[PDB]
Structures are given as structure tokens and as C-alpha cells.
């Protein structure tokens, strides 16, 4: 993985700053048009969060169609030597979702900027308002279903001993007090660890260092397949990325998410 090969998945602002000029770097920014324009990490290429999502009913959290994907990745300069570093400015939900897309397109080498722009800014690190030149036309892509749990797959696995479902929504959604679909509640057997509970606002929204014990407390252990979700697989972008970063060998994003589950005639719900 070139100048980035020696680092773990989650890296710190110092490791990135040292490597901003690496020719194999594809630095991806998933903040917002305004934030990117105000000042981004130098060489960063902007990917509007909406572009990571199908954004059509009945399950808008699914991955975008192949065409949008080919062009997006063609724009970014996707190529064999590439090593992606990903950040956002919300603690990692969009960054983590982009990383799940990287798994969806077979990319092996990437890293998450711990705390993203929030950390970068807290340390007064350099900002640029300049636009990199887009790479080229759309690249032809190979798409994988392994990183993703379909609705039927999850229905089939419910109640199993070797599965944990990590619902990343707020506890009020999980308990069906706050209802954003025809059905409120959670997926039977799921446990709850809100995406924001994994961040440490005292360290510029980095992943809390005691994260493994907290996940272990809930039975979210690496000897099990982890299937994570929220409402649209945004918030669960961060929890997918965390399971990966901790080295869980079996991790999937349920991309349909509650947007699908809470609206589908076939799905059991539990309160």
C-alpha cells in the first residue's frame, strides 16, 4: 500500500499531513459544498454525501447504480496503485459509508482519518481552497455483494447464535419511541450503540479509545458476523468502519436499513 502501507486503517492527522504529497493518494472529502469551499485538507477531492446513496424509494440507503459509481470513481482517479484516505466533518458517518463503498468496489487499500476534518481543524493543520483536477472518464467496475446484507439475507439469519445486529440509531428510535417508518422498534435480537456514542467529543470526534470493551459489553464480538444499520445506512457508515478498524473479520452493512425494514410488509419488529 506504498507510503501508507505501514499504518493501520484508522490514522491520525499527523500521519496524513506527512503524506499529503504521496502520488498514490486519493484523499476524499465528504463534508459539504460549503465546508469544502471554505477550506479542505490539501489535495482533497469532494464527494457530496448524496452521491454515495441510491436516493430512490423504496430503499434510498442502497449503493448508487453502477453508472453513477463508474463516473464517480472515474472522477476520483481510481486506479490500481491508489490508496484512499477518507474524512468528513461529522465524526465519520459519511466517511465510513464511503469506506463501505470502497469494499463494494473491491478497493483493498484505504484509511480513515480519525476525527476527520474536526480533528484536523482542532490541530490548526493546513487548509486549501483549491480544486484538484478530476482524473478522467468513468472506469469500468467490479461490484461485490459481500460487504452488504440484503433484506432477505438478514431475515434468514435472525435469531442466530453467531450473529450480532448493531443498530446505530438513537435509543429512542431503537425502542420505537421515535418512529420514522410505518413500524417503530428494532430488528429482533439487535442491540443498540448509537453512532455518536462511539465518538469522543473531547478528542475532536475521534473514535473513542475504549470502543472495543463497549462493543463487547453488548455482545458485538468479532467471533460473530456483524450486521450494522441505521435508517439509511448513513450513521451505520461509522459503525461498519469501526468494526473493520478493530479487525472484525465478518462485517456487513444492511444498506436497506430501517428505511426499508420499518416499511416492508415481511419484516418482524421488536420493541
From Swiss-Prot:
The active site is at 230 (cysteine persulfide intermediate). Gene3D superfamilies: Rhodanese-like domain. It comes from Azotobacter vinelandii. Keywords: Cytoplasm, Repeat, Transferase. InterPro entries: Rhodanese-like_dom, Rhodanese-like_dom_sf, Thiosulfate_sulfurtransferase, Thiosulphate_STrfase_CS. Residues 21-129, 159-270 form the Rhodanese domain. GO terms for cellular component: cytoplasm. Its EC number is 2.8.1.1. Pfam families: Rhodanese. It is an enzyme of class 2 (transferase). SUPFAM superfamilies: Rhodanese/Cell cycle control phosphatase. GO terms for molecular function: thiosulfate-cyanide sulfurtransferase activity. It is found in: Cytoplasm. This is Thiosulfate sulfurtransferase. Substrate binds at residue 235. Transmembrane segments: none annotated. Contains two rhodanese domains with different primary structures but with near identical secondary structure conformations suggesting a common evolutionary origin. Only the C-terminal rhodanese domain contains the catalytic cysteine residue. PANTHER family: THIOSULFATE SULFURTRANSFERASE (PTHR43855:SF1). It catalyses: thiosulfate + hydrogen cyanide = thiocyanate + sulfite + 2 H(+). Its main location: cytoplasm.
Amino acid at each position: 500500500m506504498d507510503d501508507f502501507a505501514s499504518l493501520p486503517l484508522v490514522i491520525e492527522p499527523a500521519d496524513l499531513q506527512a503524506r499529503l504529497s504521496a502520488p498514490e493518494l486519493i484523499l476524499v472529502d465528504l463534508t459539504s459544498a460549503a465546508r469544502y469551499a471554505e477550506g479542505h485538507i490539501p489535495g482533497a477531492r469532494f464527494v457530496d454525501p448524496k452521491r454515495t446513496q441510491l436516493g430512490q424509494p423504496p430503499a434510498p440507503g442502497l449503493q448508487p447504480p453502477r453508472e453513477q459509481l463508474e463516473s464517480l470513481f472515474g472522477e476520483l482517479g481510481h486506479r490500481p496503485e491508489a490508496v484512499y484516505v477518507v474524512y468528513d466533518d461529522e465524526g465519520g458517518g459519511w466517511a465510513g459509508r464511503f469506506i463501505w463503498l470502497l469494499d463494494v468496489i473491491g478497493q483493498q487499500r484505504y484509511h480513515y482519518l480519525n476525527g476527520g476534518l474536526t480533528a484536523w481543524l482542532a490541530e490548526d493543520r493546513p487548509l486549501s481552497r483549491e480544486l484538484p483536477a478530476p482524473a478522467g472518464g468513468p472506469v469500468a467496475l467490479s461490484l461485490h455483494d459481500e460487504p452488504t446484507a440484503s433484506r432477505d439475507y438478514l431475515l434468514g439469519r435472525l435469531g442466530a447464535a453467531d450473529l450480532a445486529i448493531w443498530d446505530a440509531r438513537s435509543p429512542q428510535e431503537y425502542r420505537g419511541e421515535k418512529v420514522l417508518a410505518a413500524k417503530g422498534g428494532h430488528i429482533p435480537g439487535a442491540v443498540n450503540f448509537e453512532w455518536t456514542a462511539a465518538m469522543d467529543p473531547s478528542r475532536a470526534l475521534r473514535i473513542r479509545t475504549d470502543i472495543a470493551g463497549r462493543l463487547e459489553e453488548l455482545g458485538i464480538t468479532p467471533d460473530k458476523e456483524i450486521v450494522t444499520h441505521c435508517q439509511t445506512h448513513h450513521r451505520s457508515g461509522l459503525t461498519y468502519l469501526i468494526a473493520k478498524a478493530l479487525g472484525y473479520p465478518r462485517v456487513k452493512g444492511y444498506a436497506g436499513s430501517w428505511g426499508e425494514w420499518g416499511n416492508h410488509p415481511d419484516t418482524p419488529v421488536e420493541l
